[PDB]
Design a protein around this ligand. Structure first.
Ligand SMILES: *[C@@H]1O[C@H](CO)[C@@H](O[C@@H]2O[C@H](CO)[C@@H](O[C@@H]3O[C@H](CO)[C@@H](O)[C@H](O[C@H]4O[C@H](CO)[C@@H](O)[C@H](O)[C@@H]4O)[C@@H]3O)[C@H](O)[C@H]2NC(C)=O)[C@H](O)[C@H]1NC(C)=O
Ligand SMILES: *[C@@H]1O[C@H](CO)[C@@H](O[C@@H]2O[C@H](CO)[C@@H](O[C@@H]3O[C@H](CO)[C@@H](O)[C@H](O[C@H]4O[C@H](CO)[C@@H](O)[C@H](O)[C@@H]4O)[C@@H]3O)[C@H](O)[C@H]2NC(C)=O)[C@H](O)[C@H]1NC(C)=O
Ligand SMILES: *[C@@H]1O[C@H](CO)[C@@H](O[C@@H]2O[C@H](CO)[C@@H](O)[C@H](O)[C@H]2NC(C)=O)[C@H](O)[C@H]1NC(C)=O
Ligand SMILES: *[C@@H]1O[C@H](CO)[C@@H](O[C@@H]2O[C@H](CO)[C@@H](O)[C@H](O)[C@H]2NC(C)=O)[C@H](O)[C@H]1NC(C)=O
Ligand SMILES: *C/C=C(C)/C=C/C=C(C)/C=C/C1=C(C)CCCC1(C)C
Ligand SMILES: *C/C=C(C)/C=C/C=C(C)/C=C/C1=C(C)CCCC1(C)C
Ligand SMILES: CCCCCCCCO[C@@H]1O[C@H](CO)[C@@H](O)[C@H](O)[C@H]1O
Ligand SMILES: CCCCCCCCO[C@@H]1O[C@H](CO)[C@@H](O)[C@H](O)[C@H]1O
Ligand SMILES: CCCCCCCCO[C@@H]1O[C@H](CO)[C@@H](O)[C@H](O)[C@H]1O
Ligand SMILES: CCCCCCCCO[C@@H]1O[C@H](CO)[C@@H](O)[C@H](O)[C@H]1O
Ligand SMILES: *C(=O)CCCCCCCCCCCCCCC
Ligand SMILES: *C(=O)CCCCCCCCCCCCCCC
Lengths: 326, 326
């Protein structure tokens, strides 16, 4: 007996000494010291201070620079909006609760925060997929007489919101549920508790397959091709130093992008899988926080990688920030 | 009666209800709510997470790039080291104490932390002065047949450490003192308490004049000249678009640098002056924290302005960070 069950939640601490309380009703200072709640507040604060400017800046600079407003950029705009859902839905809420030491908004708040945070990171996730598809389509030209334009970009964005809803909506209404995670200050998808009234086991399998394996496969295929096409075109122009350079740059980028996706979701998927495999397991509140640390902090590193390492976006940002020019 | 005096300290809260304790002995949760101590921890955490990389990166990239290692850069290296004194002396200590809710290292810790933090921000301050001198000397050439080289750079750096010691050493040994400030979690120079055994009034006057007015005057003169010289040289080459550009760039930079210096020290100087002028004053623990907020956060904005807006440093940083090249 390593936890304490409740109608709407699961505290990863044993109530044998009688001290465990509802994460909706009282401070959880028995599963982690107050300073650790503060450190949690500190990290949310960092994630807001960096996450907000980076992502808001992206939106804003696009409104101000025509050249950025191409169809192939729509998805990165989408990325930034997802990141903001995480910032205002997840990060700010967690900062507030962590300092109370429990999830003060009760179960319906737990649904709200869990939804918008989950919806955010999901849109972000599928955005990174759609992009890989779109890039591959544009570079490898797998369809004869096709030109990627506005309408497709819209489809890509919409597809992103549908795939996300297919994850974040079910728990609101019977298939899995939203319960406080880790240190009980923020709510996520119940992917660790055997709870059968809601059908957690089938949902976790659905998530693992449809929302992690499918995405991981599409990304590897799409970018595998992309790199192959680019490497092949350069072996056929070894006289252009430009072309050799672009090829190396495109390759380093893909490796960064792929590794970055793994860093972001492997822990959630990895932990989910272990807990599923090893039926009876005891993981603490801090351990169970690590998956969120990795995913959430991508609201910063994603736009650094996909937006700021881009030559164009960078220029406009500097212009917009320096009021005039240089 | 707005405070509570003690042999080694001054708590900005009235002990009429009997709740005030030594900032060396017990949590000060009567002068600010625990969450506010956490927010204090949060901000120190931010300042470490940004402050350390920015400033360490500066040092490290210099070790790796010959072109950076010029005499006119020695002072910026010095700036970065000052910033690190603030990071390890001030920021980390404050993070630790803020979470205890009082200055747990006692009075001798109060001396240590107060010294290294003060020494840091002081070296930083005089570094920004010496640079203005050096630049003006190099651009305005006020001395016939003079070339700024290594030996001078060394003098500049040393002068910086002497001016700083002239500020941070006296309080250790009788002229003013170090006492917990604001929320009582960090120690600074006693510039607000009338305490006469140590001679606070003469020290504050010394600080205000020698360490704020002198610096502010030298910076305005030096850079005033610099801009004048550059503006004058360009009115005489209006056919070079380069030259007109450099002139605008040099002017925007000086305005940024000068404003930045004001933002950094005006609050400490301004508050110090008011309290001196208005003899009997009551300022709270949070208000009295604002001067440190402005100064400390310069461990981030100084290197952003003086190091990262520089074209060279930027290039090498990107090279060093991208393992190889671009
Ligand atoms: C973790 O462990 C602790 C202990 O097992 C547990 O906390 C306990 O919860 C029970 C209720 O489930 C509390 O019982 C109450 O105690 C008060 C004493 O002030 C009683 O008056 C309450 O009313 C009862 O008796 C009345 C008789 O007239 C009835 O009218 C009324 O309906 C109730 O029967 C009630 O008995 C108990 O005090 C706490 N114990 C502690 C140590 O706090 C806790 O709920 C467990 N955690 C989780 C997350 O489930
Ligand atoms: C802010 O206000 C409060 C109240 O004014 C003040 O706290 C008080 O400090 C005094 C000591 O200066 C405490 O007095 C002690 O109380 C205990 C009770 O447990 C006594 O036993 C102590 O010993 C005395 O009596 C003994 C007789 O045998 C002597 O041997 C011994 O030497 C002492 O005379 C002592 O009296 C008092 O308890 C607190 N009060 C509270 C409410 O905490 C506080 O110091 C003020 N703050 C600042 C920063 O100065
Ligand atoms: C809760 O308590 C312990 C972990 O402290 C678990 O027991 C471990 O797992 C199996 C028993 O199924 C043993 O082989 C291990 O030796 C135990 N590990 C350790 C480190 O002692 C137990 O399974 C947990 N049960 C639940 C329901 O959470
Ligand atoms: C402490 O208490 C009050 C501030 O709350 C101070 O009184 C103010 O200053 C002068 C009196 O010298 C009055 O003209 C103002 O009206 C008061 N201000 C307010 C807002 O009430 C007092 O001087 C303070 N004294 C010390 C020693 O700290
Ligand atoms: C603040 C925390 C957030 C936004 C967490 C979001 C987490 C997910 C969308 C998790 C997804 C997955 C699982 C539930 C388990 C299997 C693998 C994933 C990554 C698809
Ligand atoms: C963490 C806080 C630090 C490092 C604060 C440092 C503050 C000073 C060196 C303050 C200097 C001044 C005064 C004490 C009053 C007059 C004006 C100044 C700015 C020279
Ligand atoms: C960024 C703004 C965050 C403000 C956080 C304020 C947290 C209030 O924190 C505390 O909650 C406890 C129980 O929940 C109570 O015992 C305390 O009285 C209350 O101060
Ligand atoms: C989605 C996964 C794609 C991984 C990126 C492809 C990695 C190819 O890596 C390349 O391998 C070549 C040898 O064949 C080397 O010559 C190159 O230096 C290296 O960049
Ligand atoms: C980054 C690491 C910071 C660790 C901060 C741990 C703070 C310990 O905080 C607390 O101090 C109080 C009195 O001072 C005690 O009442 C508590 O028992 C103790 O936990
Ligand atoms: C140390 C303080 C130096 C302040 C920088 C000098 C400000 C000069 O500012 C300049 O004034 C000119 C008009 O004479 C304008 O034509 C320029 O646009 C403007 O840059
Ligand atoms: C228009 O021309 C204005 C441009 C001036 C911008 C340069 C100032 C750099 C400031 C960086 C500050 C970072 C501080 C973060 C800590 C909270
Ligand atoms: C050598 O070539 C390696 C270069 C790869 C660097 C690109 C990755 C960007 C990471 C930014 C992460 C910021 C996260 C801050 C939140 C704590």
């Amino acid at each position: 007996m390593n936890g304490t069950e409740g109608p709407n939640f699961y505290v990863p601490f044993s109530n044998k000494t009688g001290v465990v309380r509802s994460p909706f009703e009282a401070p959880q200072y028995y599963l982690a010291e107050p300073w650790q709640f503060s450190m949690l507040a500190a990290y949310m604060f960092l994630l807001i201070m960096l996450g907000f400017p980076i992502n808001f800046l992206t939106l804003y600079v696009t409104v101000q620079h025509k050249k950025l407003r191409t169809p192939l950029n729509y998805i990165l705009l989408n990325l930034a909006v997802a990141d903001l859902f995480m910032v205002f839905g997840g990060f700010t809420t967690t900062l507030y609760t962590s300092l109370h030491g429990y999830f003060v908004f009760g179960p319906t708040g737990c649904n709200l925060e869990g939804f918008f945070a989950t919806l955010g990171g999901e849109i972000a996730l599928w955005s990174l997929v759609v992009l890989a598809i779109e890039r591959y389509v544009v570079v490898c030209k797998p369809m004869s007489n096709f030109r990627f334009g506005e309408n497709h970009a819209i489809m890509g964005v919409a597809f992103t919101w549908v795939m996300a809803l297919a994850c974040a909506a079910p728990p609101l209404v019977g298939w899995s549920r939203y319960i406080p995670e880790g240190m009980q200050c923020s709510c996520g998808i119940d992917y660790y508790t055997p709870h059968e009234e809601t059908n957690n086991e089938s949902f976790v399998i659905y998530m693992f397959v449809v929302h992690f394996i499918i995405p991981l496969i599409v990304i590897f295929f799409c970018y595998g091709q992309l790199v192959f096409t680019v490497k092949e075109a350069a072996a056929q122009q070894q006289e252009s130093a430009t072309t050799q350079k672009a090829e190396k740059e495109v390759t380093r980028m893909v490796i960064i992008m792929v590794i970055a996706f793994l860093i972001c979701w492997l822990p959630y998927a990895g932990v989910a899988f272990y807990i599923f495999t090893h039926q009876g397991s005891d993981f603490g509140p801090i351990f169970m926080t690590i998956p969120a640390f990795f995913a959430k902090t991508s609201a910063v590193y994603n736009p650094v990688i996909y937006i700021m390492m881009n030559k164009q976006f960078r220029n406009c940002m500097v212009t917009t920030l320096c009021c005039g020019k240089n």
